[PDB]
């Protein structure tokens, strides 16, 4: 399921539709244009762990949970080629550009 997530985030980078950071993810979430959200599971503070799926369910947005954040960060292009290795905890794909169909009937 990660490879389908990898290709949909790759084509999000191709079309520049995704928003990085919980601030930009939340702004895409609550403005009723988001398509999917991705949350990292390796979090220390639990205040923002539980409210992201509340925002997703309030605006009818699907969510994908990933165990790692640095791998998710280097997949979504937070590294330059890599010397600097940083990773994000949340990212929202607002719009798309085969396996995305697999993702969307995995949601159902």
């Amino acid at each position: 399921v990660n490879t389908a997530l990898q290709e949909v985030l790759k084509t999000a980078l191709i079309h520049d539709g995704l928003a990085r950071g919980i601030r930009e993810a939340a702004k895409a979430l609550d403005k009723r244009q988001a398509h999917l959200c991705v949350l990292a599971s390796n979090c220390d503070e639990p205040m923002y762990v539980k409210l992201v799926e509340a925002l997703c369910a309030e605006h009818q947005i699907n969510l994908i949970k990933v165990d790692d954040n640095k791998k998710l960060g280097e997949w979504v292009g937070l590294c330059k080629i890599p010397r600097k290795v940083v990773g994000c905890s949340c990212v929202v794909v607002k719009d798309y550009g085969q396996a995305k169909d697999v993702i969307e009937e995995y949601f159902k």
Binding site: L13, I14, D16, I81
Partner: peptide, 18 residues
């Protein structure tokens, strides 16, 4: 547009030049 390329060893980003 050119005729030759780097041929093998994969691609990372196609780049949006338009």
């Amino acid at each position: 547009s050119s005729v030759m390329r780097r041929n093998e060893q994969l691609t990372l980003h196609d780049e949006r030049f338009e």
